[PDB]
Amino acid sequence: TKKEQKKLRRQTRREAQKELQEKVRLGLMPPPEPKVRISNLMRVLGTE
RNA sequence: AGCUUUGCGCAGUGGCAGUAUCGUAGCCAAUGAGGUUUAUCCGAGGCGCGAUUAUUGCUAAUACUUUUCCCAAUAC
Numbered sequence: 001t002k003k004e005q006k007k008l009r010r011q012t013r014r015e016a017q018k019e020l021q022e023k024v025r026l027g028l029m030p031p032p033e034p035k036v037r038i039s040n041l042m043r044v045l046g047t048e
Numbered sequence: 049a050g051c052u053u054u055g056c057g058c059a060g061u062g063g064c065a066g067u068a069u070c071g072u073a074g075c076c077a078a079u080g081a082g083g084u085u086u087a088u089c090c091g092a093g094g095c096g097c098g099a100u101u102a103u104u105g106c107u108a109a110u111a112c113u114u115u116u117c118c119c120a121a122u123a124c
């Protein structure tokens with residue numbers, strides 16, 4: 001069903017992101033960088 | 049051999065709103081949920097409960113003194 005498909009997709013995404021965050025918690029993958037863009041150039045790296 | 053439609057995944061680029069998002073070994077539901085209008089007509093979720101910054105994670109802001117050397121005859 002549409003609800004079952006959406007539920008399956010959501011569970012898969014949550015499992016993937018939870019495993020990724022556990023990997024980040026255990027040094028296997030360095031912590032994510034802020035997603036800087038042109039509009040983000042001055043909120044993240046203003047002084048720089 | 050291109051063109052193109054539908055649904056589903058993975059992404060990328062955006063825009064919009066935080067009075068909403070999610071859960072449902074709880075209950076009911078196309079053998080019909082819900083019906084205010086269009087009712088011899090429409091046609092799906094609804095109720096109860098639970099979590100919460102009205103989804104959830106991170107990142108950052110909120111500091112200096114241990115050590116270690118010393119005075120002396122060309123003489124009764």
